[PDB]
Design a protein around this nucleic acid. Structure first.
Length: 275
RNA sequence: CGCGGGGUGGAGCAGCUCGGUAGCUCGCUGGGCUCAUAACCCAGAGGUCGCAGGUUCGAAUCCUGUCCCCGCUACCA
RNA sequence: CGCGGGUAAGACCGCGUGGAGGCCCGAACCCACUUAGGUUGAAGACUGAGGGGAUGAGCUGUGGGUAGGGGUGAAAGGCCAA
RNA sequence: GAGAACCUUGCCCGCCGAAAGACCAAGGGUUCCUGGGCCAGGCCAGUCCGCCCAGGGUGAGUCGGGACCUAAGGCGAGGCCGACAGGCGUAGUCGAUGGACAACGGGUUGAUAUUCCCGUACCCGUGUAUGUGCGUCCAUGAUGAAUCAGCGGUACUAACCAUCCAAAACCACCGUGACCGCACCUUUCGGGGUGUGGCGUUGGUGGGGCUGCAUGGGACCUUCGUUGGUAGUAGUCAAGCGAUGGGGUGACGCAGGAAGGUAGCCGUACCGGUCAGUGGUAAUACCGGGGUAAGCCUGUAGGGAGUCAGAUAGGUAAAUCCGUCUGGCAUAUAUCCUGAGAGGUGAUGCAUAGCCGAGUGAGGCGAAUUCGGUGAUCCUAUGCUGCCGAGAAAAGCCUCUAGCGAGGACAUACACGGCCCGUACCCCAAACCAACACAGGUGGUCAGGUAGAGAAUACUAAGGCGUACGAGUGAACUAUGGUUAAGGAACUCGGCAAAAUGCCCCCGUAACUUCGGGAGAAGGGGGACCCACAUGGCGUGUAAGCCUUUACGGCCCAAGCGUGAGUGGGUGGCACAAACCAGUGAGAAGCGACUGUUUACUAAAAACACAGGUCCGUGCGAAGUCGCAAGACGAUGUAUACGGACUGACGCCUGC
RNA sequence: ACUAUAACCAUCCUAAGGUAGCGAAAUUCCUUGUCGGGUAAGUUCCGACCUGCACGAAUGGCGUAACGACUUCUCAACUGUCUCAACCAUAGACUCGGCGAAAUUGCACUACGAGUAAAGAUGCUCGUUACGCGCGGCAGGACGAAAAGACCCCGGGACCUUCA
RNA sequence: AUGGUUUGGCACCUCGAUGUCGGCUCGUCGCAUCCUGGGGCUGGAGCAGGUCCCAAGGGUUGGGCUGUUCGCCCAUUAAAGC
RNA sequence: GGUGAUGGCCUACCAAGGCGACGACGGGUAGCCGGCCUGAGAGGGUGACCGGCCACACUGGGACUGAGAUACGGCCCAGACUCC
RNA sequence: UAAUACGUAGGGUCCGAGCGUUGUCCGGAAUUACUGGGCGUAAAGAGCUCGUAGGUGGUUUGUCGCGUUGUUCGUGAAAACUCA
RNA sequence: CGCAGAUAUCAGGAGGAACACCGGUGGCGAAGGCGGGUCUCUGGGCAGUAACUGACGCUGAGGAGCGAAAGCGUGGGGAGCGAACAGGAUUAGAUACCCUGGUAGUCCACGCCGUAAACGGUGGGUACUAGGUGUGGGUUUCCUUCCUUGGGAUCCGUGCCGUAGCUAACGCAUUAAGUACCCCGCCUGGGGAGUACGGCCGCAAGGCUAAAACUCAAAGGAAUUGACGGGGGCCCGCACAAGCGGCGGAGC
RNA sequence: UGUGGAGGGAGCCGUCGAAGGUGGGAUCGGCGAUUGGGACGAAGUCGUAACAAGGUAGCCGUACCGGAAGGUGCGGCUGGAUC
RNA sequence: AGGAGGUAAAAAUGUUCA
């Protein structure tokens, strides 16, 4: 859930934090911990490509198994539920009965001791991973592959889920969290249930420093930049831009999806706005 | 420092010069409906955007002084 | 968190423990608000006196990266070897 | 000395003393030391010098680095991409600011010292010798295994049974492709219409034997598995090293105390010594000392950890290792590990206050060295607790087997090798960056005392400076400080600047409030010294006592040491937070919510950011961005995410 | 129905005609608006009115506790800020010794008045005044020094914007 | 008609620099005299004035508001000069 | 200790209690009663004369004297007012 | 414009050294209802429950005698009121 | 809205909300209120038995809880409906009725709010006082078909009617507004005003508590008679309709 | 026998102490530019909300909107007419 | 006796004492 801080400081007035309640262990599993280093939003050239990134608390990568293909029929038990800074969701440490230890996305309803099944002959329970050919319609799923073997791409964030609407042929229709309906090969695998830590959205981070810890550098508005820096720049006194809204590189608002894409035929219905 | 700008029946608005300026709504007058307004009928009536000048025959109409409430008047050092 | 009160159980109240905080005062440290001086300076941007922050969006060392219509910029058109 | 304010010596005085002391790094590069010099330099002079000349000087297995490890990042075989140039990047290889790794004390020189010497250690390697001593070949065991037939289950399919289905199938029905009878009606008749008997059942309907399809149950041979011994033989294993591989560790944040300790400091037993020409003070006073490391022992406080057996392939192969699962056994002042520190040893040494003469400085002798107290920002501690923002890798070490394997392990003694670079000197500065011997800047380590909360501030020790133009002189004037009658903002754009407030403990504290604050609100009172309460209380803790598992045990505890706080009484002064240090406060409005950021060098702000909000985009090598492209960031993320725009806590709202 | 305004109405145009709330505002020219408060006296400040030159709802509106080296106003205390200035010391200034620059500089035994003049004269005219040379001081002039005026214009650039 | 202080007109020196308003300080000058002084006329009874003439010796306040000059106001003054 | 006398009446110490919705503490008003007026009575209102009690004597405070003191025509102080 | 309601006259009436008015209190007012009210629509049933304090309490035996009741004593000053 | 292929029709899909018929003077609940089905958990009631305790009861100031709808917050969702809003229409004007759309909201989760014609405008408990008639739940019993919602007796409910009694009347009338007891809440003329000030609660909206000045001589309740109705029913009239002829326009 | 000694007093000091002063609050009123609503008023303006189905039945609560009555939505009541 | 639903669109006001 959520712990609302008390207003002992102005940087804590309306602030909130997670009550790390479904979490059981403060420490991660060392074998599954790869290192990480910040980039600063900078690429191989050393140049800012994505702005508003840097500083940030040090982090370490928990090796998640988004590709749960090699443990079919080999059950596991959720040994722990842990915090992952790399993602909004929490992560569940599973002990496979063959001795393999792995991390997953920690769906809702999942606790220590819950037994996780993988494969076609698995039960339709939270945390169980199956092909969509074996998952029935109207089911709530997460961590879906876009391609067989490609690994889970979809419905990975906290509180989020995908609704499997139907299967017609070798294509399963999926209502996505954005509302977009799209087709995906039934061979693609999905984890049953909805992702946990859905309370995450309702956190008030209270102060600038907290997002500086999360690695979000300050976002400056164009209207207070100079015209050399931003199209919206300039003006004596405040301005609304002096023109229609654009990016700092002058690209206007509007659809940036490349047309004539391969996914256009798999997509059934783009998401909706305003309604 | 300096520049600018439409006027028309009682009110509000239209109408650019083949030779008239007028038309709409409201208002007003007379009648009717009602026991007595509004809505109906009109014989309905109603004005020279003020004078000067046109090439004027004649200009509300075009041009200048005036006709004058007019949006913008702004010398930035 | 504990104790006590209270309750049907609570919410809640009090006492303690506990030691949070872009919390307070204030040295180092970092800044640079005011003022005086300097203004052929002691100094190509300082001194003195006060001043602000001072566990944090902190300061700092070492090493490294981004390069010119480009970088970087909590955005002043500021900085990129006076 | 030719020459002296400046050089040398001595004595005074003064300054710093979280530094103006001591040590490093970076940087500089010989500036270090000795000797000599003095036309340049030094803001004067100069006998001096960081200046000039010459000569000398930097000694490491353990320090800091390489030979060990990797991070960011860089180069980058091949490679990909790119018109060429080249951009990226894999494997790799570099790359500390980090990881790992063995040393401490004292002495010495004119200059070096964890480097040399002395003493005592430690870490790698090497050879020889010796001894315990397992092993191979001998022997020894642990051993377990392929053949056959007997039996329980695969049940080729010969088929057996059940369930389901109709390929075709008898009967009657609905009306019939058209026609063949009976019957009735219609444009004037014609080309038509209605009920039904047969034909075809175009098709559909309801009961039915049969047969043929599919599924399941059993199940011959075929075939899998347990006994029957040839064959506990062919075979394996049993020293040790063991990985370039597997696994574990290495391996990590921030804050916060508390506890135990130590250094350090203050005293003190004890030792040695002075009389510092003053009124008193000979021991009763005063001064000085009142030390000694690593390492080896020990293994305390604190902290941490279940163990044994079996099974298992998950860890590219194998694993006795790691995981995982099963059980059994334990909840232990048990065991193990870690570990400050105490104590012992190191140390019959070394060092020292001082004493002897010697006086350039060569030496020589050398006392006591107990008790407490206080007390760290250091150690235990990479701990413990808590929290979220969720906190490097690799080597190394350990282990596993694969593998190697006939010699090998361990111990002792002796003898040996331990490489390269740095090491002088300055290092908050006169030696670095600053054009200067520049009031600037420069990261880290030591952190004495008395007061004090304190690393502030004052004074001071050790130690180091008086830092390089001076001597004078009551001018104005300027600067910096100081004081000021009466008044008290009248000054002035403006209370600018100054002044004031300022500490501790008590009391008491408003509007408003987001209930946290406002608030140190405001506004007041006390504060010194002496005595007594007080041989008190508190802390500590000795002796003594008590208990015990007997030890580095515990409890208590006279004394001793330290130490407040308060009450009462008294004393003195103008004054008691006496100096230094050290909030001014209140009301109201505007702006911005706030902490922060900003125009290095005239603007710190109402500007930026901020959390929060809305909109838009993005379905994922996304969108967006750097790039010609590859590729990269985004993101090792996946719409509760990411990017862009505007707004900018919060409240009421956000109309056309 | 006194007056005043105008709840109300008519008409024209519009895509729609500014709602809530605010309002001489960081926005109000007129303007020191008017009224009130505070003051002895207040172009500032506070409150209020609304005749909004030219507020206005995320270029957010109206408020807001707390915060602010912000801005504005007031008050207490405090004071040399002032009435109104005096005194002391120190560092300079001054003197002696020593070293020893600088910007600047067409010259020079470089007066004042009233004039004249490229219209503001040390330098010209007519007069007046003035022994020569220094030292400390003040800063009225030398249109003083410095910087080939940044304002203005002309010419040319640069960067920025855009339905060039 | 004076004067040359206002707003201006001209654009004559100065754009290889003539620094601007207001205040502070220091003043100096003129008189077109605010006070003080002398006087004429008066619709000057007296007090007090009005107007004109002569007169520039001296004096000509402190505050609130405003950057302000100016102005308004407060108290005063012999007067609160231009 | 003090009183004439009991008692926090006062004091040192000790304990932490005491009062409050049955209205504490506060605010307002008021001298109380016998009685008076009204009213069928209950009740309501009132507190003049007369009589009893209390309180006060310019305001506030204080004691002294005395058997006895709010000591009107007594004292002390302070304050306001009036007068020399 | 025909006033028994105004003003005046007569006349009448109620009081009578008084008469009227005003003010205040009670009554009437069963209009805060104890005696002595009410709450469907007149004002009035809490939106409904739970339940604290409180109020209230079925049948019965015994007891206490608190309430209650009887009696007596003392007091209830005098004056008042009432009776004579 | 369509003519860019709407409406309509067929098929498929998505999603939301509400649950036709059953379903009513019916049932349950303290009230609010509760209606698709199933499961789970759970509360209350009624009858019978009379085994148990043995007056433990009733009410309940304050207080606490529950408390329709709207509304508020946060987060989802959002088909239909739909304040506001926008057009259209009507209208003298129409910020409305009507139409077309349509936002919040209605929905879910957690919480605030705490009101309503929250009404039976009727507080709770108990006892008694004529009956009739329906209906719901349960117990029994008698004709017996031994069929049996055939009837009766009784307890609990819920309705209609009707006595006595009560009531101003309307009406209530064994589900009292009767007869009586206990307890609570509330009233004391209408306005001002359930408003201000203060306080409490609340994010807010607002709620709760709750006046005074001033003002009126009434406000009110029930019922009667009339009148009236853009209420109804029945009936008439040159009233309309069907016709004929005129007036209004000319002159007099 | 003596300016003797208890003892007492003046004076002085101290506690308490009125008045006074300082301070910050509480509480009760009055005024207050402007401003809100309430009551009354001949005869004024705008509309017609309610009473008859008052011409959209009204009213309760809530919310929103609107010159004003008021309108609309949600839920509720009948103190609602016709059949 | 037995048995669906309807339509009238809008259309205001009324000085005096009474």
């Amino acid at each position: 859930g959520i712990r609302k801080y008390k207003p002992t400081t102005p940087g804590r007035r309306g602030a909130s934090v997670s009550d790390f309640a479904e979490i059981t262990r403060s420490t991660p599993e060392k074998s599954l911990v790869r290192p990480l280093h910040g980039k600063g939003g900078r690429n191989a050239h050393g140049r800012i490509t994505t702005r508003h990134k840097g500083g940030g608390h040090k982090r370490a990568y928990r090796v998640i198994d988004f590709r749960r293909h090699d443990k079919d029929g080999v059950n596991a038990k959720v040994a722990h539920i842990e915090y992952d800074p790399n993602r909004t969701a929490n992560i569940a440490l599973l002990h496979y009965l063959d001795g393999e230890k792995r991390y997953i996305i920690a769906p809702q309803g999942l606790k220590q001791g819950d037994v996780i099944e993988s494969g076609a002959n698995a039960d339709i329970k939270p945390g169980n991973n199956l092909p969509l050919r074996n998952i029935p319609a109207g089911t709530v799923i997460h961590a879906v592959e876009l391609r067989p073997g490609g690994g889970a791409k979809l419905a990975r964030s906290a509180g989020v889920s995908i609704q499997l609407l139907g299967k017609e042929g070798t294509y399963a229709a999926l209502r996505m969290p954005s509302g977009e309906i799209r087709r995906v090969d039934v061979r693609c695998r999905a984890t049953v249930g909805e992702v946990g830590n859905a309370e995450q959205s309702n956190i008030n981070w209270g102060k600038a420093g907290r997002m500086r810890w999360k690695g979000k550098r300050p976002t400056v508005r164009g209207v207070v930049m100079n015209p050399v820096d931003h199209p919206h720049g300039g003006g004596e006194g405040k301005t609304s831009g002096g023109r229609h809204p654009v990016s700092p590189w002058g690209k206007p608002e509007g659809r940036t999806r490349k047309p004539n894409k391969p996914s256009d035929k798999l997509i059934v219905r783009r998401r909706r706005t305003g309604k």
